[PDB]
Structure 1
Amino acid sequence: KLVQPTPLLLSLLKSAGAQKETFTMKEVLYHLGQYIMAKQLYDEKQQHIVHCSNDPLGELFGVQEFSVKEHRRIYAMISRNLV
């Protein structure tokens, strides 16, 4: 069952390379992960946290930072941004 990102979430994914309006969750995760790499939001050095205090992302997930290994939380954050 495909996900349909909200216009917000979509503009991110589109600026992250996505070329369509509906996705598999893995596809969302792939572009977002690619969005995070582009905005350099990710310190591998630190402790695998993404830092988005001042990105559209952080505003979208209603969070300042998260570990890239709190998948259960990363999924919920996304879920509230799918139509």
Structure 2
Amino acid sequence: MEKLVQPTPLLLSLLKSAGAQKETFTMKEVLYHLGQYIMAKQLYDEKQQHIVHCSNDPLGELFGVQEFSVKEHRRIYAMISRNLVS
């Protein structure tokens, strides 16, 4: 089985803008919708497309960074865990 987690308000709002419909998700579902948000907002770098630019988007406040690479899975997981109801 997989644990169902509960995104805090800001993260949840970004997930729902990407199409998410519920309030609890597996981590796989959180990541998927977050990736969809990034694609929709065109936050990825044009030239190195694994790089995500947050400096001009609310995602930047949420995570607390300016850029991250989708290769940094531990960093991304950490940023998400900071934004779950404990």
Shorter chain as denominator, the TM-score bin is over 0.9
Q: CA deviation at 1:7?
A: 1.1
**Unmatched 5+ stretches in structure 2:** none
CA offsets per residue over residues 25-60 of structure 1, 9 Å max, x none? 000000000000011001262262100101010110
Structure 2 counterpart SS, 1:43: coil
TM (norm. structure 2) is: 0.92
**Tell me, what secondary structure is at the counterpart of 1:54?**
coil
CA distance in structure 1 between the aligned counterparts of 2:84 and 2:37, rounded to whole angstroms:
17
Measure, in 1, the Cα distance between the counterparts of 2:50 and 2:33: 18
Aligned length: 83
Question: Is residue 68 of structure 2 the alignment partner of residue 66 of structure 1?
Answer: yes
> C-alpha root-mean-square deviation of aligned residues, in Å?
1.1
Q: Secondary structure at the match of 1:66?
A: strand
The two structures have a TM-score, normalised by structure 1, of 0.95
Structure 1: segments with no counterpart, 5+ residues: none
